[PDB]
Amino acid sequence: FAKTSTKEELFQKFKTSNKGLSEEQVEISREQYGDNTITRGKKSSLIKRLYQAFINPFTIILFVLALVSAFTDIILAAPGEKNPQGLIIITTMVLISGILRFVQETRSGNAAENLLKMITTTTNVHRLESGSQEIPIEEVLVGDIIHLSAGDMVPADLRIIQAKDLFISQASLTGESEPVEKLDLATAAAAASITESVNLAFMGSNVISGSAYGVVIATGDATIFGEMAKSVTEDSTKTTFEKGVNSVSWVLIRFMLVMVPFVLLINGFTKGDWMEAALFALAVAVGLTPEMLPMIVTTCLAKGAVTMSKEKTIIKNLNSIQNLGSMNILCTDKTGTLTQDKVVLMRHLDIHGQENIRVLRHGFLNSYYQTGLKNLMDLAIIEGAEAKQDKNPELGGLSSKYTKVDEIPFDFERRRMSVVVKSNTNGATSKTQMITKGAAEEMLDICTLVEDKGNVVHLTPELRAYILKKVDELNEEGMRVILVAQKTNPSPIDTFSVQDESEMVLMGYLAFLDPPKESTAKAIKALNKYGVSVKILTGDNDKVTRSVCKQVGLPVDKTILGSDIDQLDDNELAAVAAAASVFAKLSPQQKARIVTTLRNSGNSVGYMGDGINDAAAMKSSDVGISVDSAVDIAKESADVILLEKDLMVLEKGIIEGRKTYANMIKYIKMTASSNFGNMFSVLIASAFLPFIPMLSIHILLLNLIYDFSCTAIPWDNVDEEYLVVPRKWDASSVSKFMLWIGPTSSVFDITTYLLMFFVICPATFGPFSSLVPGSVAYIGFIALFHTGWFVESMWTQTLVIHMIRTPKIPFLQSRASAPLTILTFMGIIGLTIIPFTSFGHSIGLMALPINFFPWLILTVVMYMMLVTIFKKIFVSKYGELL
Amino acid sequence: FAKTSTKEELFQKFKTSNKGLSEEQVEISREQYGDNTITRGKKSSLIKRLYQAFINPFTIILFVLALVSAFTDIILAAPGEKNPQGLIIITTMVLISGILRFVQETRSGNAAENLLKMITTTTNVHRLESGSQEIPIEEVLVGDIIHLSAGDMVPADLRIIQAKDLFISQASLTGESEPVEKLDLATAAAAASITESVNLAFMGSNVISGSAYGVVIATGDATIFGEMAKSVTEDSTKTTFEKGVNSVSWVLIRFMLVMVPFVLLINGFTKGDWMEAALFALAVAVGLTPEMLPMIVTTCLAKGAVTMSKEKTIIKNLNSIQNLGSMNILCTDKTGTLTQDKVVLMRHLDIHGQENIRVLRHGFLNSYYQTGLKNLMDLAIIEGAEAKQDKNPELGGLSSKYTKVDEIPFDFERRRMSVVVKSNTNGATSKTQMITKGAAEEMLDICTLVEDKGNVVHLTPELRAYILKKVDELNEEGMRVILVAQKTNPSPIDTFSVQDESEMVLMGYLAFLDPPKESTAKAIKALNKYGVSVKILTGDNDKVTRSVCKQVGLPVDKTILGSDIDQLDDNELAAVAAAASVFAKLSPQQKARIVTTLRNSGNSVGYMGDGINDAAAMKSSDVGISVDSAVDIAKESADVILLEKDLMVLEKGIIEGRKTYANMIKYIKMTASSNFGNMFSVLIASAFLPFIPMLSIHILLLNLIYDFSCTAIPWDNVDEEYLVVPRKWDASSVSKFMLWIGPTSSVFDITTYLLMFFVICPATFGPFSSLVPGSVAYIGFIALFHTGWFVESMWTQTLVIHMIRTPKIPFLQSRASAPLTILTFMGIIGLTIIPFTSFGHSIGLMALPINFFPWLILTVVMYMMLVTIFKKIFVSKYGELL
Ligand SMILES: [Mg+2]
Ligand SMILES: [Mg+2]
């Protein structure tokens, strides 16, 4: 906590050695404080940290199901080599799921190029070697004498000891392209925010002209710019989506490790050899886990990103749009993001508070014949002249009458620009008037004549009070005022002096605000409509960010200043930030801290900005956006970088992202319930069946071929009501839903059991308990049961989706199954309904007797209606289906 | 034991003086044998013997309601007075069951007046005390010298010592009214059956002609008539119906003994309020018992008996028609029942086996002119000659052409009767014709000429050989044979005398037999079609019964006699009875012995009879059927009485007795299943519901208003494939239809347990676990949950009978139900108005919302499909969904 509090000790005296730094003292300084360097790095072993997640309940199944092959190996040959139709499928599934979990994050890693910039060298500095020279950056240290000249860049913060009308553009840290004066004088003892610390310089700021001497007092981590450079590394926190998917996988694992040992114990103690029990438990381990869930998740995310890639928005990280959908609080930079860093006239009125055409027309003249020096405020005046709709050409023709005799341009030493022009009225060369505008200070000091009530009077103390009150109403919004005044004079044979420019008749006041973008208000309203709070994080002065956001409609209440959050501890910081609004005067570390605390409270926080100072906040957020005017480094740190300028597209994301999550939270439940029910019946009927109902490979086929319809699940129609609230990744609701709707299938999977064990299978192959257990029709009976339960389970688990996807009254009310999904479903049922081919060496073909299908349709219909009842109960119990 | 083998000690002597018998002799007889009395008795405790059955669960239920009333009233005062609402109805139901069980049993008990009838005494006895007198059979002594005249009553079993062509009518024991000769000579010591007991007589027989002196061998219960009187009592054996009903009641008792102590323990261990657990167990016990089962059973039996009473067949016992339906073997008497006890001509034949009309004509005149004495034999000849297709009136003309000279009537010495007639053709006094008929043996000895092939030859030994061969050929066929001889006699000076009966000329022989009733063969065929075997237990000789067994059509092999069947043991008798179709020479002991043994072998046996000898078997059988020609004792001791003597109606009765059974079992399987289901769910809910789902009174109302339509089930449409095999009462068969298609209603009862837990929470009653245990909530919420699975449990168990009623036939191949049992069924479902009535305040039972019915319809439609699937699984595993 080494701060720069040595006031009046570091002024007028270097407080250290003047360039004669002792070697021992140099070593002491570099030990206790260190040098000025910025460290960065990359990684290429992302595979190690991206495999482990939901891959493990696949490599565990692989290890168990290959140890099964090893167990039947070394003893048997055909049973020990007929397994690989397992191991191979499970291994390629492991590889696919791992590669997909890799690509879901690879876009962020390979699209982040925040390293090309900085590491600046070749600094024009005064050194003891040869005076003013180009020196490498590693030769400037704490206590070194550094000079800022015309065109050189400051490499480290400085305690400036000499200044001469020095102006610096601090858009790198404050986001404001307008230059601000920087002086060598000691500031206030209590000081202010770091950006307003005139006595100290900032790394990364650009100087165009002027020279200044200073001494480096801070380097390393104490540099604010060093801070944002060091903060932007591969500290990519796990967003909401990753944690949600991990929690869902852990719910599945918590179910698997409770169900598997139970069925293992039952089938080991009850009837069979422990090899049969191991196979039986492997069946329940395979069935519970939806094998192609990562593929469906990736395809949903890809659909979202592709859709958002047509609204003209680069999506950098593929996992950004779901986070955009689940966005709860949007923290937004002010300078250049919602405003447009463009000075435009908004208040230009007489001393009574109404627009004066004459004064603005005079300003238009002084700015349109302004050939000496062009300045952004002059462009503001001229553009407002045309926005005013009062025609220019008369004034354009007034060049022939109100002829420009001469001009003293906007010289910065006196902050006065004075155009001396003659009023050729009606053809005669009349008197000459000069109009000077400049900063309010000198104008107020020199002005004693005022145009009031239509005449010219002296500047009385009451008129001074009135003018000061107008200045105060203009300043309280954080807007600077430039005074304009005309003076009449006879034809000047001699030149004009500064002392003659006094007692000049002032017209009024000017206000060049940075107006918010025309779509900002509509974007804020749309964001508030979809349950997304909006907060403002800007380094600008509090007054201007009350003025703005008192114009966009956002409730501005007790704007928190930077010092308050700096002195505030983390818990009450989180308490304040959530229940508050626009913040002011923040450093990049402050923005990152605020976003992080908002994250820790349980809110998925997105961020938007354009400046380099916003990079830390962009990277610390769940989803970092960037408007078109964003700087290149901010673009690289972004995730959903925009292109046009319109913020309306934000809602087109927030809508679309939500309709992705629903389509992903549908399947995740809609396939975890069924897969539970299918695996429930292989548990509570795992003791009465003298053989496993459906083998491991058959269940792998069922969970694979059915999961290719969920490839078309992302195109299903989410109705209109899920898309109004940012939904949280509630995995516990999954563990309830699949315990409520899942078992309703299991009973019918028992009805299919008894049926197919008593009337269908014994019909063709004779009654059971009368067949030789070795082989004869025992193989045929077992295969017929296998294929029949295959067909029935597939039908009944992929046709109930039309009943589960939507809340009450499907079809008629909510026209379900948008044609892509329903087409794929009926195109994949027609695939699984064919175990009649040469692909019946899957250890069951047993072409089903026609007698079975009437009993299959009767099961499907009655299961669909029972699921309707249980869906009603579930909706009426907790809050809804998902 | 003491058979008629005590010869040279008691036979050919008296062992006492002839009629010179003293007092010491009668005291010796009393000491050696005892009183000569017949034991008789009755009872009037039918109430105690007939209450116990399925009424004991009702009395236990009454006791438990009484305990609940006392417990809720010995502590509290307001709750302890609503228990009468259940106790009174249950205690009226106990009495209803008692009355309806006493009625369906005591009809046969008070329909038996066997002991009231019979009891004959006052026989003519000679004694030294007062000469000839009338001494009661209660006063006859062993060894009494008894004088026998025509028309007297035999006092005891009687070894005759003096006889002169003594003839005894033995229809009382053999069923044949035709007299049998009884001889006093020294007979065989080993003797034979009663029909061949030529040396001794039996009780109850009337002497037709002749006088005799005999000695009493035994008295009291040792006599055959005394034996049958002792065996025939009010010992109506438990028919198969009572055993089946007790088995069903015991199935229910085992089910409630397994369930009730489970619910009580679950609710006494969880939710530790033991009173509320006893209420749960009481509810389970109340809902498990079908409360109006005895009334439905009684109404089914009454419908069967009433509808059979219309077919000229008075039914004496309510259970007779049901036992007829469940009858498996029908044992019928031969004489009087299968045959018609009427001698009829069947073979008028010459001496060499050619149909000679001349012998028929000679018999015609020989009978038509026998005016001095008429007999059934002569009437038989006359009737058969009318029916022999030969025109009798032409023969009648010969009556005017053959006038009578004289006649020698049937004498008591030579046993021949003769008519001497003229041959006055056109009035011309030609030679006389003498025609003598009688027993073959005598006039076969006295014959000297025979007429063969139109000529006359001497009585050579060869022709006599063929005459006897054909005579005992007819005797082998059972035909009673008579011989007829003509003599061409020159005009005698005087009338025809005994010496005029020499030098006969035989013409031929005649065959008299009692042909079976013309409907006997058709009845036997119809019974054999319905899986009812027929046996011909009779006391007649083996020859005639073997002949009849061929005409009607039956297995003529293994004509098991009476001596051997008396010789062999019961265990072997069971084996040989099922392996034999015709039984001959049977004493009334043996008929009852055979019927009882066949009953013990697992066959429900009915008996048909017409005589006194039948009564023992009639009472020892499941159902006794009496023909029109039966003696009043046979009519009184039977259970079914015919009125048109047409056996063809019999099969019709069986059909009724089967369908009356089918509906009944269809009822028992309908209710006992549903009840179980509707009180299986409670078991499960016992661990989860915070309160009782239905109180005892609600379940009583459900089981009473649903059993008031099973009063209309007996009129439903029974199939036509169920009535082609005698169905046996099976308890296990109703315990496996109750575990199989019963728990398929629990699935749709745990659903309406949960739907009704989250569809009436919004019924202004708020969600549960939020209501204080006060009122207008916890009182209304519970009431609405009752009016839930009350209305729903009445709809789902009264409308699923149409699906279970029949074996596999969905709704159209059987025309499910008759208009009576569908109209009543829906008219009792329309009693879903109890909740919306002033009598909807039998505590609970509050007004249902309209919202419930769309779910009730869905549940009652869902449940029928599951019932169809389990019906198909049940039919295809056991064999009959009955
Ligand atoms: Mg399934
Ligand atoms: Mg029910």
Pairwise CA distance, residues A528 & A523, whole Å: 9
Parallel/antiparallel/unpaired status of strands A159-162 and A212-215: antiparallel
Q: Which of A152, A157, A184, A333 is catalytic?
A: A333
Picking from B761, B858, B877, the nearest residue to A869 by CB comes out as: B858
Other beta carbons less than 10 A from residue B347's beta carbon: 17
Residue A582's closest CA among A533, A626, A516, A630? A533
Core vs surface per residue A82-120: b (16+ CB within 10 A) or e: ebeebbebbbebbebbbbbbeebbebbbebbebbeebee
Q: Which residues of B touch A865 (CB under 8 A)?
A: 858, 861-862
SS3 readout for B89-142 = HHHHHHHHHHHHHHHHHHHHHHCCCCCCCCCCCCEEEEECCCEEEEECHHHCCC
Judge whether B552 and B337 are in contact, CB under 8 Å: no
Distance (angstroms) between ligand 1 centre and the Cα of B318 equals: 54
Helix (H, G, I), strand (E, B) or coil at B37: coil
Task: Count helices and strands (H / E) in chain A.
Answer: 31, 20
Q: How many CA atoms lie within 13 A of B213 on its CB side?
A: 11
Judge whether B422 and B402 are in contact, CB under 8 Å: yes
Q: Which two tokens stand for residue B498?
A: 């005994």
Give yes or no for B758 touching A (CB within 8 A): yes
Q: Return the ∠ at Cα B810 (arms to B804 and B812), rounded to 5°.
A: 120
Residue A764's closest CA among A785, A795, A749? A785
- A755 and B873 within 8 Å at the Cβ level: the answer is yes
- B761 and A869 within 8 Å at the Cβ level: the answer is no
Q: Which two tokens stand for residue A654?
A: 């927030």
Chain-centroid distance of CA B77 in Å reads 57
Give A489's strand partners.
Answer: A432
What is the resolution of the experimental data for this entry, in Å?
Answer: 3.3
- Which residue reads 């915070």 in tokens? B690
Q: How many CA atoms lie within 13 A of A50 on its CB side?
A: 20
DSSP label of B724: T
Query: Largest Cα–Cα distance in chain A?
Result: 132
**Residue type at position A303:** K
Q: Which residues of A touch B867 (CB under 8 A)?
A: none
Q: How far is CA B386 from CA B365, B379, B381, B393, B643, in A?
A: 12, 11, 9, 9, 29
Interface-testing mutation among B744, B769, B864, B877, with chain A (most A C-beta atoms within 10 A): B877
Pairwise CA distance, residues B528 & B538, whole Å: 20
For B207, phi and psi rounded to 5 degrees? -75, 125
Give B145's strand partners.
Answer: B215
Q: Which residues of A touch B753 (CB under 8 A)?
A: none
- B877 and A755 within 8 Å at the Cβ level: the answer is no
Residue B868's closest CA among B828, B798, B811? B811
Picking from A758, A759, A877, the nearest residue to B758 by CB comes out as: A877
- A758 and B869 within 8 Å at the Cβ level: the answer is no
- Which residue reads 């009077």 in tokens? A457
Give the nearest chain A residue to B872 (CA atoms): A759
Judge whether A540 and A193 are in contact, CB under 8 Å: no
- A873 and B762 within 8 Å at the Cβ level: the answer is no
- Which residue reads 């923005």 in tokens? A591
Residue A699's closest CA among A141, A117, A53, A90? A90
**Residue type at position B414:** R
Pairwise CA distance, residues A438 & A509, whole Å: 11
Domains and their CATH numbers in chain A: 23-32+117-231 (2.70.150.10), 49-107+238-306+654-877 (1.20.1110.10), 328-341+517-621 (3.40.50.1000), 344-513 (3.40.1110.10)
Parallel/antiparallel/unpaired status of strands B533-535 and B329-332: parallel
CA dihedral A488, A491, A492, A498 (to 10 degrees): 0
Pairwise CA distance, residues B218 & B4, whole Å: 11
Pairwise CA distance, residues A506 & A467, whole Å: 10
Pairwise CA distance, residues A862 & B384, whole Å: 76
Pairwise CA distance, residues B741 & B728, whole Å: 21
First to last CA, chain A: 51
* Chain A nearest C-alpha distance from B871 (Å): 10
Instruction: Tell me the technique behind this structure.
Output: cryo-EM
Task: Specify the length of chain B in residues.
Answer: 882
Q: Which of residues 834-873 of A touch B (CB under 8 A)?
A: 855, 858-859, 861-862, 865-866, 868-870, 872-873
Q: Which two tokens stand for residue A802?
A: 């039309």
Q: E strand or H helix at B541, and its extent?
A: none
Q: How many CA atoms lie within 13 A of B710 on its CB side?
A: 29
Judge whether A199 and A21 are in contact, CB under 8 Å: no
Residue B864's closest CA among B783, B727, B748, B755? B748
Mark whether B646 is an active-site residue: no
Which strands sit side by side in the sheet containing A428-439, from one edge to the other? A404-411, A416-425, A428-439, A482-489, A505-508, A449-452, A455-458
Picking from A858, A865, A873, the nearest residue to B754 by CB comes out as: A873
Judge whether A655 and A723 are in contact, CB under 8 Å: yes
Distance (angstroms) between ligand 2 centre and the Cα of B668 equals: 16
Residues 6+ apart with CB under 8 A from A171: A177, A611
Q: Which residues of A touch B762 (CB under 8 A)?
A: 876
3-state helix, strand, coil in chain A (%, to 5): 45, 15, 40
Q: Which two tokens stand for residue B299?
A: 């109404």
